[PDB]
Amino acid sequence: KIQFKEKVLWTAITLFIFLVCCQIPLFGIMSSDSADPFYWMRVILASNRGTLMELGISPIVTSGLIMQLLAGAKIIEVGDTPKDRALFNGAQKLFGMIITIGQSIVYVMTGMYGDPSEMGAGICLLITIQLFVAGLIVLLLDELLQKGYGLGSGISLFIATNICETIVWKAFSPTTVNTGRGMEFEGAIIALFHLLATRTDKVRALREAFYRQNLPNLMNLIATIFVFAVVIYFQGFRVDLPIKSARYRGQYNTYPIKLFYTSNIPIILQSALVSNLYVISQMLSARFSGNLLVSLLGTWSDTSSGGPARAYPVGGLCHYLSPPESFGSVLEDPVHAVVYIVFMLGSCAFFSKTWIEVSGSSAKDVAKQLKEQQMVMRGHRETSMVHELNRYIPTAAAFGGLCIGALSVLADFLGAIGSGTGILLAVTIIYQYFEIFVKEQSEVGSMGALLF
């Protein structure tokens, strides 16, 4: 069922079970994970999920997109499917579930006979399963609630939550620092300082000498601030113009669109594919099939995908996507930093324009809505509705996401936190989510912190 209040609440109940599951995947027994490391991929990967072992919660985030794939599609004939009995839409939804399951199986180990995967890197079958129990309640919620047409405000809240958890997890992580400070920022602080530090705040910023060994953590505090000031400013611009409103009775409440609203959601997706692509590529090039001679032939040397003799993620797609990495401290590579900014900028504007059509806000959709809740007929002309309302809606959708996508690449350079790439994506989401949480609810706000 539709209801802004219901959709936010469902995401909240799920959210807790993510953390209860997490601890056993973390460190259990002697278990270790060999390679993976990076940050940008990790914040994306993190639909409430963190630690050394990859992709526990990952099929679950995906599932919502699968539902959109078919429920509001139609073209390639097989509508109403040659299936016995009948009953479509729910049938499409059932097909959607199968696609999610197929994705899951390949990562996890499977039995030797009928196996059809593996021989590379995988396993994590026990490790995945506890996350799967948390994410099963999400999947089951999606099945019932949707009934072949569904949407939901799932996406934003899970990813957003995780980074706050991660910073706390890092604090109790041992960095082979001396026995603990007892409340300075995790690590990098000498033994003499540590005994003092527990007692209360004094010392730290004003002192007589501290710190400086190999900081990791003064970078964390200043990271948040850079994002903090500009995000709030751009959640302030708006276009109004409504008068006489609600029909007669006449009484007016202003209609608000930020114009960074309905624009933000494509950008999160745009960041997400690219970061994942960078981690995976290594497997395709070196250890799958085919690309030995083919690599040499294709890669002229300018940069082409699955490039020969490339160490770290393969040259091509990855090569433009980043420079050393170096946490933004080496970027004077006139050829890497420049391409990174421009590629992301062009990709972001593409996904903003495709969001308009039938997956988000367009001027035709808004036309019908303002006919229902009646602006007073909006002051309007003799009929010529077709233009009127239209012109500032494609420009607004494009502009909103284009600004954020430009900013994100530069933001990595200025300073992400302990992670050094990870912060920026998560923080932006929390501000957007807060507006979904209370403003859409159209009455009161949050829930919890009461009892009963």
């Binding site: 990952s58 985030v61 995906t62 997109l65 599609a73 390639i76 994705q103 899951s104 390949v106 594919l273």
Partner: peptide
């Protein structure tokens, strides 16, 4: 509509893998 969705789906597909 489908075409747009499919493009998005391919992008998504790698993430889970």
């Amino acid at each position: 509509v489908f075409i747009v969705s499919v493009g998005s789906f391919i992008s998504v597909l790698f993430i889970v893998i």
